[PDB]
């Protein structure tokens, strides 16, 4: 329960089976670390029976949206949750609704 280290939505290096298992309702979301891509983040949130994984950091280490930026990845999840707005990326409005829960991974 402290920064990305134990944030309420940051689960940590998750897998494709566990992350998808956390999406029980269309709207739950969570951030994890790309296992194949060391030094990258991802957002596995269900929008309506179709999990969407978006990289929180672009190929040049830069979190942003269709026309915005996030000083920190935590600022990204708190920005969309502040106005229930989507994240958008390449044709997918990943909308957030309820953060899952971990607070323990990330080290």
């Amino acid at each position: 329960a402290e920064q990305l280290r134990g944030e309420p939505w940051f689960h940590g290096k998750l897998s494709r089976r566990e992350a998808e298992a956390l999406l029980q309702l269309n709207g739950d979301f969570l951030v994890r670390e790309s296992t194949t891509t060391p030094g990258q983040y991802v957002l596995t949130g269900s929008q309506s029976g179709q999990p969407k994984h978006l990289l929180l950091v672009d190929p040049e280490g830069v979190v942003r949206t269709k026309d915005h930026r996030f000083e920190s990845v935590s600022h990204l999840i708190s920005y969309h949750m502040d106005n229930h707005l989507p994240i958008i990326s390449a044709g997918s409005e990943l909308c957030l609704q309820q953060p899952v829960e971990r607070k323990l991974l990330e080290h």
């Binding site: 978006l54 990289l55 390449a90 997918s92």
Partner: peptide, 14 residues
């Protein structure tokens, strides 16, 4: 290459 791609927020380019 390809891959699985994930994405990103954002972009776009190219």
């Amino acid at each position: 290459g390809h891959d699985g791609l994930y994405q990103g927020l954002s972009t776009a380019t190219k």
